[PDB]
Amino acid sequence: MATEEAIIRIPPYHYIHVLDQNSNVSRVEVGPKTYIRQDNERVLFAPVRMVTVPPRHYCIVANPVSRDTQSSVLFDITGQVRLRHADQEIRLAQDPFPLYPGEVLEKDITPLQVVLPNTALHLKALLDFEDKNGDKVMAGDEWLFEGPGTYIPQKEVEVVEIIQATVIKQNQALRLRARKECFDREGKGRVTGEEWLVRSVGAYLPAVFEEVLDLVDAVILTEKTALHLRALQNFRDLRGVLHRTGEEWLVTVQ
Amino acid sequence: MATEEAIIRIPPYHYIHVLDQNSNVSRVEVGPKTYIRQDNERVLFAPVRMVTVPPRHYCIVANPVSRDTQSSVLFDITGQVRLRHADQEIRLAQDPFPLYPGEVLEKDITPLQVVLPNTALHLKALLDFEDKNGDKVMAGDEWLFEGPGTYIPQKEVEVVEIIQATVIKQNQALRLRARKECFDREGKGRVTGEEWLVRSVGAYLPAVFEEVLDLVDAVILTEKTALHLRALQNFRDLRGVLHRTGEEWLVTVQ
Amino acid sequence: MATEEAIIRIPPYHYIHVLDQNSNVSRVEVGPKTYIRQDNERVLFAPVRMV
């Protein structure tokens, strides 16, 4: 049922064979095994399936522009005996090992990285529970990423990156419409659909928050000015004074 | 009555045979058995039925985009001995076992998820009596789903998801048309067609409740205002005062 | 280098195969082995010589 593949094949190039003949026993998940190699394909078996592949790489161009794929877990160690054709895998520069037969759902993502005010990352869990350092994740909820580098492009789909809000003290303050049961990332106060005030200078929008609008104060250290305000919910102002809706006050150099 | 199917067939591909020849005795519900497999289909029997199939899979692409089907329970354990062609099944990634002969009612549903205020799930029982953990459902009534994860798309047809209502305190409160003998899902009072008021902030319409309108309050902490009211049923107000229909009172900074 | 010799063959009849592939070790002088037999010649190896 086939011919001797005694063909010349170049060193970085790829070729898929014995896809038709039997595969291994036990947990050794070598299915129909194949080879990417330098030499002439001398073929000891004619029954073997022949798949015409000229150009292919296993090259991860430095750490930038890296790759992912369907796990083809053929080699293992004394610690990680991973599920082969059940899981999906992600790759860095540290993988210049040659290609396999059971690979699907893959491309080449460039590892984008961002730091502090620069930008943030709005990850979630597409099906993940506990894939990252030092503890465990709960359902399909969402995390914040602020500071230096990047991470694994796996088991999380990021909502987006967020270009944060920037606040120049006295002239500015930030409004933040809480969106879920959202606990305040900056204090104990929280309620869905509610409104927020940022008194800190140039800070970031936590995943649950939302930059509504940036609101500039009216300057009233002036003996020649006072503010006319209408309390809109029952509360205490910045200066801690009991206030009921509709009530009207004027604020002035206190 | 047929030919030797000695044909080459790829590892994840599927083929249907012996659909014409006799089936098993006793509870072993193997009918005309078939095989999805890696190797060459050597067929020791010519009488066999040949169902021409190139591309197929048992691929449940991670937990998302998963699949269900008409049951085919050939392998069982000690804890489970199932009816194979009466029932109907639902499947996740945790089942990459091959295909069968009795497959009829199936597709590729992505197990959509929603959590907290975000959205709700208006589940009903299409035929079901007790399909879910730690107890037993009464006929084809309706539940709600609120918080973290998803579940089994099986014995329950969902009415819809429900993008909930949202109320901002003193400015707002909700109206809810109770539609069944509906017991109040936030209190004790109840009656069909009746009218409700939501006094909590940003919440969710339970299954029997219906979002009518959200009603904003008139600001009357004003010394220059009072509200003219007309009691439409015999009752006691927010402030717990005896009222009768027709009756008119005015409400002012109390 | 050849085809699956899945052919029908009669009981007293004869056929010569695996003439091309390797032969045995030691004093067991089976070279390119063959078979005369009753059944259908299912051939697990395609490289086999067909006579």
From Swiss-Prot, chain C:
Localization (cell): Cytoplasm; Nucleus
Start-end of each MVP repeat: 2-51
Modified residues (N-acetylalanine): A2
Lineage top rank: taxon: Eukaryota
PTM field: Phosphorylated on Tyr residues after EGF stimulation. Dephosphorylated by PTPN11.
Subunit structure: The vault ribonucleoprotein particle is a huge (400 A x 670 A) cage structure of 12.9 MDa. It consists of a dimer of half-vaults, with each half-vault comprising 39 identical major vault protein (MVP) chains, PARP4 and one or more vault RNAs (vRNAs). Interacts with TEP1. Interacts with PTEN and activated MAPK1. The phosphorylated protein interacts with the SH2 domains of PTPN11 and SRC. Interacts with APEX1. May interact with ZNF540.
Entry comment, domain topic: MVP 3 mediates interaction with PTEN.
Summary of the function given for this chain in its UniProt record: Required for normal vault structure. Vaults are multi-subunit structures that may act as scaffolds for proteins involved in signal transduction. Vaults may also play a role in nucleo-cytoplasmic transport. Down-regulates IFNG-mediated STAT1 signaling and subsequent activation of JAK. Down-regulates SRC activity and signaling through MAP kinases.
Name by which UniProt lists this protein: Major vault protein
Organism listed in the record: Rattus norvegicus
